[PDB]
Design a protein around this ligand. Sequence first.
Ligand code: HEM
Length: 129
Amino acid sequence: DGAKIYAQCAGCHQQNGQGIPGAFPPLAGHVAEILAKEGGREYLILVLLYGLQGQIEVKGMKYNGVMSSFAQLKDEEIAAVLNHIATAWGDAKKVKGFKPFTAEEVKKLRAKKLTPQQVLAERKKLGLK
Ligand code: HEM
Protein backbone atom coordinates (compact mmCIF):
# COMPACT_ATOMS: atom_id res chain seq x y z
CA ASP A 1 0.00 0.00 0.00
CA GLY A 2 0.73 3.75 0.05
CA ALA A 3 2.16 3.63 3.61
CA LYS A 4 4.69 0.92 2.58
CA ILE A 5 5.90 2.87 -0.50
CA TYR A 6 6.30 5.95 1.71
CA ALA A 7 9.20 4.16 3.48
CA GLN A 8 11.23 5.11 0.38
CA CYS A 9 10.46 8.79 1.20
CA ALA A 10 10.56 8.84 4.97
CA GLY A 11 14.38 9.04 5.23
CA CYS A 12 14.08 12.61 3.92
CA HIS A 13 10.53 13.87 4.39
CA GLN A 14 10.26 11.95 7.72
CA GLN A 15 7.69 9.51 9.19
CA ASN A 16 5.34 12.31 10.21
CA GLY A 17 5.82 14.08 6.83
CA GLN A 18 7.01 17.29 8.46
CA GLY A 19 10.38 17.25 6.65
CA ILE A 20 13.61 18.75 8.05
CA PRO A 21 14.02 22.56 8.11
CA GLY A 22 16.35 23.80 5.38
CA ALA A 23 16.97 20.33 3.95
CA PHE A 24 13.77 18.43 3.05
CA PRO A 25 10.44 20.28 2.60
CA PRO A 26 7.42 19.25 4.68
CA LEU A 27 4.66 17.27 2.99
CA ALA A 28 2.23 17.38 5.96
CA GLY A 29 0.18 20.60 5.74
CA HIS A 30 1.93 21.46 2.44
CA VAL A 31 0.41 18.94 0.00
CA ALA A 32 -2.96 20.71 0.45
CA GLU A 33 -1.28 23.98 -0.65
CA ILE A 34 -0.07 22.34 -3.87
CA LEU A 35 -3.42 20.56 -4.51
CA ALA A 36 -5.22 23.92 -4.12
CA LYS A 37 -3.47 25.12 -7.30
CA GLU A 38 -4.74 24.42 -10.79
CA GLY A 39 -2.29 21.78 -12.07
CA GLY A 40 -1.24 20.95 -8.50
CA ARG A 41 -2.03 17.23 -8.62
CA GLU A 42 -0.25 16.82 -12.01
CA TYR A 43 2.73 18.64 -10.52
CA LEU A 44 2.98 16.14 -7.63
CA ILE A 45 3.09 13.29 -10.18
CA LEU A 46 5.83 15.06 -12.14
CA VAL A 47 7.98 15.36 -9.01
CA LEU A 48 7.83 11.59 -8.49
CA LEU A 49 8.32 10.73 -12.16
CA TYR A 50 11.09 13.22 -12.92
CA GLY A 51 12.53 14.62 -9.68
CA LEU A 52 13.03 18.24 -8.65
CA GLN A 53 15.78 20.86 -8.32
CA GLY A 54 16.17 24.58 -7.61
CA GLN A 55 15.30 27.11 -4.94
CA ILE A 56 11.76 26.82 -3.61
CA GLU A 57 9.80 28.22 -0.69
CA VAL A 58 7.68 26.13 1.66
CA LYS A 59 5.88 27.83 4.61
CA GLY A 60 8.12 30.85 3.98
CA MET A 61 11.30 28.75 4.37
CA LYS A 62 13.83 28.31 1.52
CA TYR A 63 15.00 24.95 0.13
CA ASN A 64 17.73 24.51 -2.40
CA GLY A 65 18.22 20.82 -2.89
CA VAL A 66 17.72 18.03 -5.35
CA MET A 67 15.16 15.24 -5.37
CA SER A 68 15.79 12.16 -7.46
CA SER A 69 13.29 10.66 -9.92
CA PHE A 70 11.15 7.70 -8.69
CA ALA A 71 10.09 6.53 -12.15
CA GLN A 72 11.10 2.98 -11.25
CA LEU A 73 7.91 2.86 -9.15
CA LYS A 74 4.95 1.56 -11.13
CA ASP A 75 1.97 3.75 -12.05
CA GLU A 76 -0.05 2.20 -9.18
CA GLU A 77 2.81 2.65 -6.65
CA ILE A 78 3.14 6.37 -7.50
CA ALA A 79 -0.67 6.73 -7.21
CA ALA A 80 -0.50 4.90 -3.83
CA VAL A 81 2.26 7.01 -2.24
CA LEU A 82 0.66 10.22 -3.49
CA ASN A 83 -2.63 9.18 -1.83
CA HIS A 84 -0.66 8.46 1.34
CA ILE A 85 0.97 11.91 1.39
CA ALA A 86 -2.42 13.51 0.56
CA THR A 87 -4.32 11.71 3.36
CA ALA A 88 -1.91 10.59 6.14
CA TRP A 89 -1.69 14.10 7.64
CA GLY A 90 -5.15 15.41 6.70
CA ASP A 91 -4.09 17.50 3.69
CA ALA A 92 -6.99 16.06 1.62
CA LYS A 93 -9.51 17.36 4.23
CA LYS A 94 -8.65 20.99 3.33
CA VAL A 95 -9.43 20.23 -0.37
CA LYS A 96 -13.07 20.21 -1.54
CA GLY A 97 -14.04 16.79 -2.99
CA PHE A 98 -10.50 15.40 -3.34
CA LYS A 99 -10.40 12.57 -5.85
CA PRO A 100 -7.75 9.89 -5.11
CA PHE A 101 -4.74 9.54 -7.39
CA THR A 102 -5.08 6.79 -10.01
CA ALA A 103 -2.70 4.81 -12.20
CA GLU A 104 -3.90 6.38 -15.46
CA GLU A 105 -2.99 9.91 -14.32
CA VAL A 106 0.59 8.72 -13.82
CA LYS A 107 0.63 6.77 -17.06
CA LYS A 108 -0.48 9.88 -19.00
CA LEU A 109 2.33 11.97 -17.53
CA ARG A 110 5.00 9.28 -18.05
CA ALA A 111 4.33 9.78 -21.81
CA LYS A 112 6.09 13.17 -21.79
CA LYS A 113 9.49 12.99 -20.13
CA LEU A 114 10.64 16.15 -18.32
CA THR A 115 13.93 17.15 -16.66
CA PRO A 116 14.02 18.23 -13.00
CA GLN A 117 14.65 21.77 -14.25
CA GLN A 118 11.40 21.54 -16.26
CA VAL A 119 9.63 20.26 -13.11
CA LEU A 120 10.69 23.42 -11.26
CA ALA A 121 9.25 25.44 -14.22
CA GLU A 122 5.96 23.56 -13.68
CA ARG A 123 5.98 24.40 -9.96
CA LYS A 124 6.44 28.10 -10.80
CA LYS A 125 3.51 27.83 -13.28
CA LEU A 126 1.31 27.00 -10.22
CA GLY A 127 2.01 30.42 -8.64
CA LEU A 128 4.33 28.83 -6.09
CA LYS A 129 7.47 30.72 -5.08
C1 HEM B 1 8.54 8.62 -3.17
C2 HEM B 1 9.10 9.20 -2.09
C3 HEM B 1 9.08 10.74 -2.05
C4 HEM B 1 8.01 11.53 -2.17
C5 HEM B 1 6.53 11.11 -2.32
C6 HEM B 1 8.46 12.89 -2.11
C7 HEM B 1 7.65 13.98 -2.23
C8 HEM B 1 8.09 15.24 -2.61
C9 HEM B 1 7.28 16.31 -3.13
C10 HEM B 1 5.76 16.18 -3.36
C11 HEM B 1 8.08 17.38 -3.34
C12 HEM B 1 7.68 18.77 -3.89
C13 HEM B 1 7.52 19.76 -2.73
C14 HEM B 1 7.29 21.16 -3.26
O1 HEM B 1 7.36 21.37 -4.49
O2 HEM B 1 7.01 22.08 -2.44
C15 HEM B 1 9.42 17.01 -2.95
C16 HEM B 1 10.56 17.80 -3.01
C17 HEM B 1 11.81 17.46 -2.50
N1 HEM B 1 12.17 16.20 -2.04
FE1 HEM B 1 10.96 14.48 -2.02
N2 HEM B 1 9.84 12.88 -1.95
C18 HEM B 1 10.24 11.56 -1.90
C19 HEM B 1 11.52 11.10 -1.73
C20 HEM B 1 12.58 11.90 -1.42
C21 HEM B 1 13.87 11.48 -0.93
C22 HEM B 1 14.26 10.00 -0.69
C23 HEM B 1 14.62 12.59 -0.75
C24 HEM B 1 16.09 12.64 -0.26
C25 HEM B 1 17.12 12.08 -0.96
C26 HEM B 1 13.79 13.75 -1.10
C27 HEM B 1 14.16 15.08 -1.07
C28 HEM B 1 13.49 16.17 -1.59
C29 HEM B 1 14.06 17.50 -1.74
C30 HEM B 1 15.48 17.95 -1.36
C31 HEM B 1 12.94 18.34 -2.34
C32 HEM B 1 13.02 19.84 -2.71
C33 HEM B 1 13.87 19.92 -3.99
C34 HEM B 1 14.36 21.33 -4.16
O3 HEM B 1 14.86 21.90 -3.16
O4 HEM B 1 14.26 21.87 -5.29
N3 HEM B 1 12.56 13.28 -1.51
N4 HEM B 1 9.38 15.70 -2.51
